């Protein structure tokens, strides 16, 4: 259970972390690497902001099993996505006419 103040804080932070990436990509603010790093980092930070301010994620709810489940799910997603990308990159490279 949050409050109005934390909800508005998350709202403003989400607005900033959403506007900046869109402006950076639209206007070509910096180099492609800088733009990519900025948008990815801000996306991760905004996800954290939503998890804290809006979902009230904490290490005590449900005897800590709420946080445990979230962290385990993030690890499983990392395994699945990174492994799939790595496997498919290697497979596609080995599928070429070389």
């Amino acid at each position: 259970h949050g409050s109005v103040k934390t909800y508005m804080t998350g709202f403003i932070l989400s607005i900033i972390l959403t506007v900046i990436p869109f402006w950076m990509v639209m206007t070509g603010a910096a180099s492609p690497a800088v733009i990519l790093g900025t948008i990815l980092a801000m996306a991760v930070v905004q996800v954290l902001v939503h998890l804290v301010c809006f979902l009230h994620m904490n290490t005590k709810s449900d005897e800590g099993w709420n946080m445990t489940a979230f962290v385990f799910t993030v690890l499983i997603i990392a395994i699945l996505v990174v492994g799939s990308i790595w496997i498919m990159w290697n497979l596609n490279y080995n599928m070429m006419m070389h």
């Binding site: 949050g2 996800v47 979902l55």
Partner: protein
């Protein structure tokens, strides 16, 4: 039993997160399978996506307002905030349907290429989740109006809170990975 249900719904949402992750991996694998058709840069209109993002974020904040009203035991404010959230989500869905219709009528639908298939799968799965959330929200609004803020309805409001905020989090991931990275 409310806490048990809310925790169980959180676990279900973890499973839904893995579902979306598989869709994201498929999109990453197939993003360049454009098959001589449009790429992301040729169809992603960033101002449109920004308006959609703001609609979904406003809906998340309004649901937070509804939850706050629920903890203040104010039925009318709960219903009003839920209605505003429903309108914002409906606007997001309408914009998404308009985008998909525009792509389809111009021979740019999922059957055109692997990239378009993956884009439709990911974005439309998110949209289907939003539509389910909207049907759920409408049912819950009617139930709250019929019987007020019972313990049953409070647990349901919390479960739908989890669902709606999670949908906006998934959308953060979606716009970052799909639209911003394709447009760049």
């Amino acid at each position: 039993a409310g806490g048990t249900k809310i925790f169980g719904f959180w676990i279900y949402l973890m499973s839904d997160c893995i579902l979306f992750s598989i869709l994201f991996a498929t999109y990453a694998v197939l993003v360049n399978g454009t098959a001589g058709g449009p790429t992301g840069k040729d169809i992603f209109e960033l101002p449109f996506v920004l308006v959609e993002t703001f609609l979904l974020l406003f809906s998340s904040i309004t649901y937070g307002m509804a939850a706050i009203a629920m903890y203040k035991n104010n039925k009318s404010q709960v219903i009003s905030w839920l209605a505003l959230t429903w309108l914002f989500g409906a606007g997001f869905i309408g914009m998404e349907i308009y985008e998909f219709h525009h792509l389809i009528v111009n021979g740019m639908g999922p059957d055109r290429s692997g990239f378009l298939s993956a884009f439709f799968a990911l974005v439309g799965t998110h949209g289907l989740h939003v539509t389910s959330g909207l049907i759920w929200m409408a049912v819950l609004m009617v139930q709250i109006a019929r019987r007020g803020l019972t313990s049953t309805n409070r647990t349901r409001i919390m479960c739908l809170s989890l669902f709606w905020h999670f949908l906006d989090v998934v959308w953060i991931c979606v716009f970052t990975v799909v639209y911003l990275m394709g447009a760049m």
